Amino acid sequence: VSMTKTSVDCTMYICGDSTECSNLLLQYGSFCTQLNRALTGIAVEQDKN
C-alpha cells in the first residue's frame, strides 16, 4: 500500500555544511530543487495511497 516516506536534503547530501561547495552547487541551478520536489511528491502520494 505504501513505502517509507523519504526527504533527502539535497544540498547536504551533495556536500554537508560547506558553503565553499554550496555556492558552486548553486551554479547548476534547478536540479537540487527538482530532486526535493520529486521526493516530496512521492512522500505526499504515500498518504494518498
Partner: protein
C-alpha cells in the same frame, strides 16, 4: 576516543491556513527533539 555526532538538522515545514485568513503560522522541525531549538 571521542565520537563525532554531526550537528542536528532537519526539514522545516511551515503550517498555515490561507494568507487570505491570517499571517499567523505554526512551524514544524521535522524529526527534532526541540529541547535543542531554544538553545539555538
Amino acid at each position: 576516543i571521542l565520537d563525532i555526532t554531526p550537528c542536528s538538522f532537519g526539514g522545516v515545514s511551515v503550517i498555515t491556513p490561507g494568507t487570505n485568513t491570517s499571517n499567523q503560522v505554526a512551524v514544524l522541525y521535522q524529526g527534532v527533539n526541540c529541547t535543542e531549538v531554544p538553545v539555538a
